[PDB]
Amino acid sequence: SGACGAFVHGLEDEMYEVRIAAVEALCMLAQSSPSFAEKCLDFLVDMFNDEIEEVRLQSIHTMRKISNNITLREDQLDTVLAVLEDSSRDIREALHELLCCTNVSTKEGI
Amino acid sequence: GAASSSVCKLDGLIHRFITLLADTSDSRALENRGADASMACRKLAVAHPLLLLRHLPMIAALLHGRTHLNFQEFRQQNHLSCFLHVLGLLELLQPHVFRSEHQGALWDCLLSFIRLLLNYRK
């Protein structure tokens, strides 16, 4: 069928408005389903690499909103700590809000 | 009273030994160190079982941490040695680990064990 990768196309879309709307949809659906959230963590991590600052901020806020059930791995943790290095203060504050609620499995992650 | 806001004169030392027990690598020298750690911890278990059970959530968290790693690295890193050591220690803390206070960390350890069983059932 042609419905495969709908959210893949949405998050890879060239307009940041479409990507922000996709982020909101991911937020609502993840608040509904935890398994879908676990599946879609990686795409949110990719959005943390997004070139538009607002998209990064909103994706981080949604990840914070849905962190209550998921638990990350070492790949996710190093990628998240990577974007925290960035210069802009507001996105760093957003990462700080994220880490307040994020889960972790290994002590080495901490 | 084991859950009280109190400090044991020996707790830090058994913490040191349980860190030595859990932390291991492929090194046979570190495996000998872990075997000695299991020996001392087991002697403390049979001698002073209540002291170890106060540190149960710690080793439970370590068991939680170590469970994800795939079977091949699990066997090569000797993590099965750690798993059988903690399982034997829990067996040797038999009539006291089933209390209400130790129930949560016990369930955590059992959760780690069953997660290991499911992941490497092949």
CB of B115 less than 8 A from some CB of A = no
Shortest CA distance to B117 belongs to which of B88, B59, B74, B62? B74
Give dist(CA A18, CA A57) in Å, integer: 15
The answer to whether B61 contacts A108, with C-beta atoms less than 8 Å apart, is no
Q: What is the resolution of this structure in A?
A: 3.7
- SS3 of B77-109: the string is CCHHHHHHHHHHHHHHCCCCCCCCCCHHHHHHH
Q: At what angle do helices B56-66 and B11-22 cross, to 10 degrees?
A: 20
Residues of A in contact with B65 (CB under 8 A): 105-108
Give dist(CA B13, CA A109) in Å, integer: 25
Give dist(CA B119, CA B98) in Å, integer: 26
What determination technique applies here? cryo-EM
Q: Which amino acid is present at B34?
A: G
Residues of A in contact with B70 (CB under 8 A): none
Our measurement of the distance from residue B55's CA atom to the centroid of its chain's CA atoms, rounded to an integer in Å, reads 9
